[PDB]
């Protein structure tokens, strides 16, 4: 039920033509050239689609279990074409071995992360079986969130 | 014929909706509001249209040789409905005949105005009577703009 964004509003989504507003306001200050179609209407440059066949068939491992790899390991990173990742997230798709994470000066300590939003260390301290599937998922996504957010958090201290 | 500004070629007067392009760019850069009637009409505040008859009659002062004043003398300043003049020229109509307007400590000197366009005295030692009436009367009004141009020329140079 919960919207990624609001307004007024707890449960839909915000206002069409005040997002409008918004990008028209936001692309006149930095003086760029807004189009409302080509922020609104969809575009074809796009995400993969699927069907339910090929979906379930070939991300299915036993089928293909005759292999000496399964094609969800590499480059299907948990079911996402590889390129189809990095390019949206505007990468240069070659490597397949992704190996970036240890690039980290000054991992951020966790005693500063659990002060705030610390219902979160509690809920696995509480019943974690007694909690719905989806939720503690989405709170160590949330955790996850967190770890990111004060690993950022000393430039946007700095600007 | 030739126009005041020129469009693509001499002759020709620039284009409507480019200056409509040219508004809209400005003024969502210098951040100023825009409808667009507002600026491409004329508004209800111009100047008087006149007729034939009073604007022959009341500035011909044969009619009005009895008068102790001339009106066009103090108050119509070569025929200008006066209050039109200032508030058009955003100049306070009260105090109405002011005086401080030749106020210039270093003004400026003829030498660098002679440098400077300098076919005016070219076509004053040319023929100064035997073109049009146009060609002198411009040549009066290029030193006019000359004038204003070398009086006003050092803050443009500081700024």
Chains 1, 2 share one sequence.
């Not at 000496?68 to 949206?88: R, S, V």
């Amino acid at each position: 039920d919960i919207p990624i964004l609001r307004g007024k509003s707890l449960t839909t989504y915000p206002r069409e033509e005040t997002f409008s507003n918004y990008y028209t306001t936001v692309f006149r200050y930095c003086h760029l050239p807004y189009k409302r179609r080509e922020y609104f209407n969809k575009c074809n440059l796009v995400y993969p689609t699927w069907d339910e066949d090929t979906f379930r068939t070939f991300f299915n491992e036993e089928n293909h279990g005759n292999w000496l790899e399964q094609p969800e390991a590499f480059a299907f990173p948990d079911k996402i074409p590889f390129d189809f990742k990095k390019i949206m997230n505007f990468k240069s798709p070659y490597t397949s071995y992704s190996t970036n994470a240890k690039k980290d000066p000054f991992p951020p300590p966790k005693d500063l992360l659990v002060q705030i939003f610390p219902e979160i260390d509690e809920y696995k301290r509480h019943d974690y079986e007694g909690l719905s599937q989806n939720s503690r998922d989405f709170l160590d996504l949330m955790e996850v969130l967190r770890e990111r957010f004060l690993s950022n958090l000393p430039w946007i201290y700095k600007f």
